[PDB]
């Protein structure tokens, strides 16, 4: 697997780092900080070893470090490194890739 | 009944009046009076109220096609009903 | 796969448009804003690559892109592409296809 | 599978056409319009493809288009064609199939 | 399969007919009609295909017609032939069967 900061996933999950959130709009209106919710969007930095759920051999986990993912609205655990905050997730609850 | 001049007063109550009013005052066509008025209108008397828009759509389909003024007698006209009435 | 707006599905997710509601009936009456609820008619737009779901080799969606198909009513995801909506299903959930 | 009004059943699902309802009894008595309730005879219109559920190969389904049977009291899903009402099961739901 | 009245069931289900209930003792006296309540004792009239539980080729039915067995309690489908009525039940909830 790939680790970062020290860190390394077991199995598939996989490490997303949450995008920073939006406090003005594309006017001059800024945003209260109460109100933005919780960003879906984020980038992988961390990826574990394999899927061991898979019969026989383990499969790989299907993306990639460096990539922009759609992340779900309920899943996802907390994890502190270096005292800033990260999600680990696993790989089935990726919604979608995005592609440049 | 009681009057409200110094000379009493006959009247004649003629047609047909059950004394109710329109539900919502976007109806009013005549300005003078704030009165509703047609003219070869069609009826439609309807025993239990009507909410369901399934339930009004074709009476108001007919009076189009047709080009005449529609006035709908029943228990009571719910919130969707009267959003499209109004509305159209 | 097919991307779609620098989106991509991953596994064996479809994402679709819903087509307009309807406000004006056959006759010469509009329908409140308030009163079309919800379409089931929808359009794909993007493929996911494969199945995870089948053993051994993954298999692919059996849908392709460009189809018309009869959305459940309860299910779906509902995702944001330059403001405008998008609802993503997997492919068990798709409940028919239209023919022409 | 078999298209029937521009649409085809995915999968297993299948399209099946709910029969009309008796008005008159044997006699001469005709009877109430809410009392007859739901009727369980029903014909099929249109079939889906194969079983997904099958491993490996797809197994298709046990009926074709034409026969009678016999539906449960609680499943179905509804969809409308031109109007007319049709109702939707899966391959394994139905009960049982009626023989000439 | 084995066709019964004008039916067949589908898969393993099996049809069978409920015995009369008994309304006199071992003695003269006679039991009311609203106490013997239901009966576990039925004959099989008609068998389905195979069971399609069974992955790969599918295994015929444990029973055959002209058998006596006995049902369970609780559960059981109703389905009305000829204006009599008779139950459909899955293979595997027959709880025994005769021998003579």
């Known amino acids: 697997g790939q680790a970062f900061r020290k860190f390394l996933p077991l199995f598939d999950r996989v490490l997303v780092e949450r995008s920073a959130a939006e406090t003005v709009t594309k006017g001059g209106i800024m945003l209260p900080e109460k109100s933005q919710g919780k960003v879906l969007q984020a ?19 299907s993306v990639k470090v460096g990539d922009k993912v759609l992340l779900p609205e309920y899943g996802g655990t907390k994890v502190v490194l270096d005292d800033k905050d990260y999600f680990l997730f696993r790989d089935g609850d990726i919604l979608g ?3 440049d | 009944k009681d009057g409200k001049t110094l000379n009493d007063e006959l009247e004649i109550i003629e047609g047909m009046k059950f004394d109710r009013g329109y539900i919502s005052p976007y109806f009013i066509n005549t300005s003078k009076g704030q009165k509703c008025e047609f003219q070869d209108a069609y009826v439609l008397l309807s025993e239990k109220k009507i909410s369901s828009i399934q339930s009004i759509v074709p009476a108001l ?9 529609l006035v709908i007698i029943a228990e009571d006209v719910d919130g969707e009903a009267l959003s499209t009435l109004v509305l159209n």
Chains 1, 3, 4, 5 share one sequence.
């Open chain 1, 97 to 99: 890739k995005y592609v």
């Open chain 2, 61 to 69: 389909e007919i009076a189009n096609a047709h080009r005449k003024p």
């Open chain 1, 43 to 61: 980038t992988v930095v961390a990826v574990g070893s394999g899927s061991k759920g898979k019969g026989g051999e383990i499969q790989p986990v």
